[PDB]
Design a binder for this molecule. Structure first.
Ligand SMILES: *[C@@H]1O[C@H](CO)[C@@H](O)[C@H](O)[C@H]1NC(C)=O
Ligand SMILES: [Cl-]
Ligand SMILES: [Zn+2]
Ligand SMILES: [Zn+2]
Ligand SMILES: [Zn+2]
Ligand SMILES: [Zn+2]
Ligand SMILES: [Zn+2]
Ligand SMILES: [Zn+2]
Ligand SMILES: [Zn+2]
Ligand SMILES: [Zn+2]
Ligand SMILES: [Zn+2]
Ligand SMILES: [Zn+2]
Ligand SMILES: [Zn+2]
Ligand SMILES: [Zn+2]
Length: 233
């Protein structure tokens, strides 16, 4: 149970605008989330997520999200990205942020009068996967491997970020990465914990594009997707 928090995702704005009772509830399931991180089709969730609870498709803008960039950054700029995991839904696993560098695909997700098809959502996923923002692109950022994976397996990569293991120190799972206080960010079910990293933005410019957050659960056959509207100029 989780969603992207910084920069403010469509999921965050959705909650803050009164529309989304459970921002953390945008789940893709059932899927094989593990150990092949990119195998599972995104179906209806797409790169921005679909919230079954409130029946919100975030892949399309409304009056409350997706109208314009929430934040503007510079090409190649190193930025803070944060997601929020629920106290009762810390599934461990691995997460990544991506930018699709094909504007004609992303445009289909910036029009309030158009809902992208399942075909377009998958095309975008594929584009986003080409535009993954590796942990290791930020100099000085320590990029560990998953305690729930072994060398050679499809999950054994450190372009993606990893949560801590379950049986780990006294900093387990995704909460353990920041080891922040409860309610360091908002979730509706049991209160939230921040999970904070850095990414380096591409030398790719847009007045309006997306960062798509993807969390592949270890504990569960579930994926969590959010997107944030940004500019790189
Ligand atoms: C954004 O839009 C304005 C007006 O068209 C333009 O001057 C600016 O240079 C654009 N930057 C982009 C597309 O990155
Ligand atoms: Cl993926
Ligand atoms: Zn969950
Ligand atoms: Zn609130
Ligand atoms: Zn993918
Ligand atoms: Zn794969
Ligand atoms: Zn726009
Ligand atoms: Zn800046
Ligand atoms: Zn600039
Ligand atoms: Zn365009
Ligand atoms: Zn088609
Ligand atoms: Zn494909
Ligand atoms: Zn190191
Ligand atoms: Zn395994």
């Amino acid at each position: 149970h989780g969603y992207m928090y910084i920069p403010s995702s469509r999921t965050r704005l959705g909650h803050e605008a009164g529309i989304d009772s459970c921002p953390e509830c945008a789940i893709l399931e059932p899927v094989s989330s593990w150990p092949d991180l990119d195998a599972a089709p995104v179906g209806r969730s797409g790169p921005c997520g679909y919230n079954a609870r409130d029946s919100i498709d975030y892949n399309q803008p409304t009056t409350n999200w997706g109208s314009d960039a929430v934040q503007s950054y510079s090409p190649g700029e190193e930025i803070e990205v944060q997601w929020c995991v629920d106290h009762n839904g810390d599934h461990g696993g691995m997460f990544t942020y991506r930018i699709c560098q094909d504007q004609s695909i992303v445009d289909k997700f910036l029009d309030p009068s158009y809902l992208p098809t399942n075909d377009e959502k998958q095309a975008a996923e594929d584009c986003f996967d080409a535009g993954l923002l590796p942990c290791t692109d930020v100099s000085g950022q320590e990029c560990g491997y998953s305690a729930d994976c072994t060398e050679g397996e499809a999950c054994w990569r450190n372009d993606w970020f990893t949560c801590n293991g379950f049986e780990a120190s006294d900093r387990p799972k995704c909460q353990g990465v920041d080891n922040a206080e409860l309610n360091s960010c908002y979730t509706s079910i049991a209160g939230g914990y921040t999970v904070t990293k850095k990414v380096k933005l591409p030398e790719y410019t847009s007045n309006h594009t997306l960062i798509s957050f993807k969390w592949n659960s270890f504990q569960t056959g579930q994926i969590y997707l959010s997107c944030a509207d940004i500019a790189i100029q």
